[PDB]
């Protein structure tokens, strides 16, 4: 039989998906198609905008971003960013959140952009005249961010190796007073990288510290003297 | 016929390009400074300590600074050393991040 102590300990100890991602993408396609039908009926296309919170709250899950990208999220986002039958842009919220998500979804490979058409779908919004300036800036930076890899460029300055900088620095090398005067830092351009210039007491002190601790007039429950850190 | 913007994405700046550094100039003397900084560059280019700077951008929409492009920040400085209107931006120059460089040569619509 279990002891009440072990029941308590086990009870407290007891406190410590690709299929649902696929189903989410299916629901995103259903929502965008229903909004196409509603737009043809000249009704408000609420389905995408009604699902948006649930979708955004899941695309942010760091542990699933690979699953999301590999499951065809880029295709669904392209469908949501695409203009409707009357060539109107999607709800402002959809553009704002999906563009922000795409910035936070950097693992996207070139083949993924080319196959999903998400690049076309964002370049479209970047060119589009009815797009707001903030969305145009997001689309612009997305287009730069996604095109740099095509040209092998990169924007992470911490990404260039040490030897690359040392080599580049060699590639770029050219051919009275009455009081103390504060000297100013050397402006010299350093090219060349310099070669490097290369207990019995604490046991007794710990023992004495332990004796000091042992001598204290401590109490089992720390009484709040002035009401600070009062429990519950 | 390749579109103009697509042929443009190719030119973007990378980590391997000379960084564009902000400096600080006396307002309305940014153009007079950048040009005088050309005369400084020309005067030193043949001596033993030529200026290690590549370009100095003084946008019209901005009012307060010229930007010096140089591989290493300290190159910007040796150029601006002793230059008067730029004496204010001598102690510090902020690198405009690689993603906020294309929007320095941004012009929105002289006329």
């Amino acid at each position: 039989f279990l002891s009440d102590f072990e029941m308590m300990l086990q009870r407290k100890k007891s406190m410590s998906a690709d299929d649902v991602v696929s189903a989410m993408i299916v629901k995103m396609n259903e929502a965008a198609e229903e909004d196409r039908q509603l737009n043809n009926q000249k009704k408000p296309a609420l389905k995408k905008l009604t699902l948006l919170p649930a979708v955004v709250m899941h695309l942010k899950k760091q542990d699933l971003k690979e699953t999301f990208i590999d499951s065809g999220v880029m295709s669904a986002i392209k469908e949501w960013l695409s203009p409707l039958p009357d060539r109107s842009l999607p709800a402002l919220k959809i553009r704002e959140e999906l563009l922000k998500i795409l910035q936070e979804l950097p693992s996207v490979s070139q083949e993924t952009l080319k196959h999903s058409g998400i690049g076309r779908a964002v370049m479209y919004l970047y060119k589009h005249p009815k797009e707001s300036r903030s969305n145009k800036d997001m689309a612009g930076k997305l287009i730069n961010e996604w095109s740099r890899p095509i040209f092998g460029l990169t924007s992470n300055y911490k990404g260039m190796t040490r030897e690359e900088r040392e080599q580049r620095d060699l590639e770029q090398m050219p051919q009275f007073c009455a009081r103390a005067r504060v000297p100013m830092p050397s402006n010299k351009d350093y090219v060349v990288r310099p070669k490097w210039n290369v207990s019995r007491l604490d046991k007794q002190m710990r023992k004495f510290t332990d004796i000091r601790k042992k001598s204290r007039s401590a109490h089992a429950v720390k009484i709040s003297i002035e009401g600070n850190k009062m429990p519950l | 016929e390749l579109s103009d913007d697509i042929t443009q994405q190719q030119l973007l700046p990378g980590v391997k390009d000379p960084n564009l550094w902000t400096v600080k100039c006396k307002i309305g003397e940014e153009r007079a400074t950048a040009i005088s900084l050309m005369r400084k560059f020309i005067a030193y280019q043949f001596t033993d300590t030529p200026l290690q700077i590549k370009s100095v951008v003084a946008p019209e929409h901005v009012k307060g600074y010229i930007y010096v492009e140089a591989y290493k920040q300290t190159h910007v400085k040796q150029a601006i050393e002793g230059v008067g209107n730029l004496r204010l931006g001598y102690w510090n120059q902020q690198m405009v991040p690689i993603k906020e460089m294309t929007d320095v040569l941004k012009v929105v619509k002289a006329n």
Partner: peptide, 13 residues
């Protein structure tokens, strides 16, 4: 080849 890649990825008529 590289601009054609960018054209196919961002080409919008």
């Amino acid at each position: 080849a590289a601009l054609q890649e960018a054209q196919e990825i961002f080409g919008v008529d």
